[PDB]
């Protein structure tokens, strides 16, 4: 096996060896909760709870594309209610920027729409935003598709003006994937290429419950170590419906570090000798954001 032991220390030694050149990160809502961003797919967040005044045919209609295009006001009213007070990426986000800086980041696949990967310094080429992003918005008319930045969209959301395209006056929609929209072609094209090349899968802040994102762990080569940094263990085969194997006598490459994602990434950076680099980057970028 590539890991000398099934621990964070084993993963760090592997990352420092000549065998580990290309890292894929798979990240979800757990890497942004410490930035104040709620998990938008968690029932505990109550997205579908206080929608009475919108008179929706069904709760999920507020995130379905056909309903949105007919009645966009509920979605934008909710977007104003949930809009974050600040966009400050976490230690976890900046850990991935360090991976990029050190030439180790093959790709970050993210389920999040909060743009924090981009703010932290990952570029378009580095990212597969599996459910899109609020970072850009587009006119919904196929013949126009004018693109608008988040500052433009934010102003419309906060002034309670339904965003309309300045060229053709069609609705302008954030580039998140609504229910009933196609998933991004980039998700499938990158998956088909990246997983031929990966040396390590870093899975952070995702319960691996939403498809097709969760199936990415099964795309890794059989030898590729997979490290889960998450508050709870996840990704194992489901005894009912049925994967990660952390604990059996047959386990050989999967490792679980259970705790806050920031503390896990900090622990890994520390083992790698990157803790000062990570502290200096985070404190500098946070200072810069706080000073805007």
């Amino acid at each position: 096996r590539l890991l000398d032991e099934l621990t964070l220390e084993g993963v760090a030694r592997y990352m420092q060896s000549e065998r580990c050149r290309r890292v894929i990160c798979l990240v979800g809502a757990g890497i942004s909760t410490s930035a104040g961003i709620p998990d938008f797919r968690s029932p505990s967040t109550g997205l579908y709870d206080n929608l009475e005044k919108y008179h929706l045919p069904y709760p999920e209609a507020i995130f379905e594309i056909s309903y949105f295009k007919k009645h966009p006001e509920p979605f934008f009213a909710l977007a104003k209610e949930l809009y974050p007070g600040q966009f400050k990426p976490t230690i976890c986000h900046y850990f991935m920027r360090l991976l990029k800086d050190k030439g180790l980041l093959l790709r970050c696949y993210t389920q999040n729409i909060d743009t924090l990967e981009r703010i932290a310094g990952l570029e378009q080429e580095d990212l597969v935003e599996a459910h899109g992003t609020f970072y850009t918005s587009h006119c919904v008319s196929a013949s126009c598709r004018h693109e608008y930045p988040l500052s433009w969209m934010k102003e419309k959301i906060f002034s309670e003006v339904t965003p309309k395209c300045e060229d053709c006056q069609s609705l302008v929609k954030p580039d998140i994937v609504f229910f009933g929209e196609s998933l991004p072609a980039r998700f499938f094209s990158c998956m088909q290429s990246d997983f031929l090349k990966v040396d390590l899968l870093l899975v952070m802040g995702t319960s691996l419950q939403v498809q097709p994102f969760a199936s990415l762990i099964s795309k890794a080569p059989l030898s590729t170590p997979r490290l889960l940094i998450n508050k709870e263990k996840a990704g194992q085969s489901d005894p009912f419906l049925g994967g990660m194997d952390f604990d059996s006598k047959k386990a050989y490459r999967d490792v679980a570090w259970l705790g806050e994602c920031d503390q896990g990434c900090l622990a890994l950076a520390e083992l790698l000798g990157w803790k000062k680099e990570l502290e200096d980057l985070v404190r500098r970028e946070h200072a810069s954001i706080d000073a805007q």
């Binding site: 009933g180 196609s182 998933l183 072609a185 939403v210 097709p212």
Partner: peptide, 7 residues
């Protein structure tokens, strides 16, 4: 391409 669904 496959469309986004609850699951």
């Amino acid at each position: 391409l496959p469309k986004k669904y609850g699951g």
